[PDB]
Structures are given as structure tokens and as C-alpha cells.
Amino acid sequence: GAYNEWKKALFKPADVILDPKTANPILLVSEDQRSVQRAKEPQDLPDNPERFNWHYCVLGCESFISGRHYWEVEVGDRKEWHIGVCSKNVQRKGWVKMTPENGFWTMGLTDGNKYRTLTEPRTNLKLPKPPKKVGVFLDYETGDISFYNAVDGSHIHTFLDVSFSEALYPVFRILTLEPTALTICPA
Ligand SMILES: C/C(=C\COP(=O)(O)C(Cl)(Cl)P(=O)(O)O)CO
């Protein structure tokens, strides 16, 4: 609605491209670095320090330490996906639960129709329609991370008044083998 339109006018549109050096080896990062898909088997890649070696995650190339930013992600009909932001210093080696206290502010979909916010404990979301494009608002100084349906502007979830102390990266996670990719909408 009009509030979402006000916010998109205030917040700076971010041009997010995926960083292949961060992507778990089971992930396929597209050549234009806008899309991510899951491979049948892990790729033969180094275990460089930037790479998630357990979680099926990939980061954007640029992080945020200030300001108001937003980007939109086409999830389409994909039956499983989680997106949001995470701190630069999240645990990338070995499993960690993706939670705000561990530096992840994310939400998404499992099993086709189970929407969750990845809070601790996880919160189930009641969405009136399944989103096909999802917008992410980041307001660094106030500490707000918000998710919205990018087509009709309706609300999905707000993380409210977080105290950020690190740079923040867009983060993307996909677990399933299925033909629909995740694609970032360009700024
Ligand atoms: C197997 C993987 C994620 C499953 O995540 P996970 O076991 O941490 C969970 Cl089931 Cl706790 P989540 O979906 O609630 O985060 C690889 O990224």
C-alpha cells in the first residue's frame, strides 16, 4: 500500500549480485550473478574462508554498514527458500542455527506452503497469498529488517529495532532440488 510506496521512495534501491566465493559448493551461481540454483552434487571448489561449508547459503558481494536500502527477489513458484541479511562475522564453517542472536535475519518457505521467520524459536507466518517477489528493507541505524510482497506491497515480517554492530550482507539459502531458481531483481 501507500506506506510501502513511501518506504521504497525513501530507501535506497540496492543492486545486489551474488558472490560465488561465498556459496556452498552445492549451489550454482549464475554467470550474471543474479540467480542461484542447487546442484545434484557439490562442485569441486576450494574451502576458502569466505565459503559456507555446511549451510547452503550464498552472500551478496557488497555489505551495508549504514543507511536505508532495499532489494527484491523473485522466488516464483520455488517450494523452498530462505532470504534476508546476515552479519559479516557469522559462522560460515560448521552448522549454526540461523537466528538473530547468531547474526541471521531471514525468513522463507519450506515444503511448498510453510512460511517461517527464522527467529528463535522459529515463528510460523500466516500469509494471505504466497509471495512470488519478496522485498527486503534494511534500515541500519534504526535496526529494522522488513520483508514484503513486492507485487502488492503487503507485509510479510518485520524484525524490529535490532542493534547492529557489524556490516550486513544479503543472504540466500536453498535446500531442494527443483527447477525454479531464485533471482535477484536488478536495481
Ligand atoms: C540442511 C541445511 C539447512 C537446514 O537448516 P537447519 O537444520 O539449521 C533448521 Cl531445520 Cl534449524 P532451519 O531450516 O529451521 O534453519 C543447509 O543449509
Residue numbers in the entry: 297 to 483
From the paper:
The relatively weak activities of PCP analogues can also be explained by the molecular glue model, as their enhanced pKa values lead to reduced binding to the basic residues of the butyrophilins.
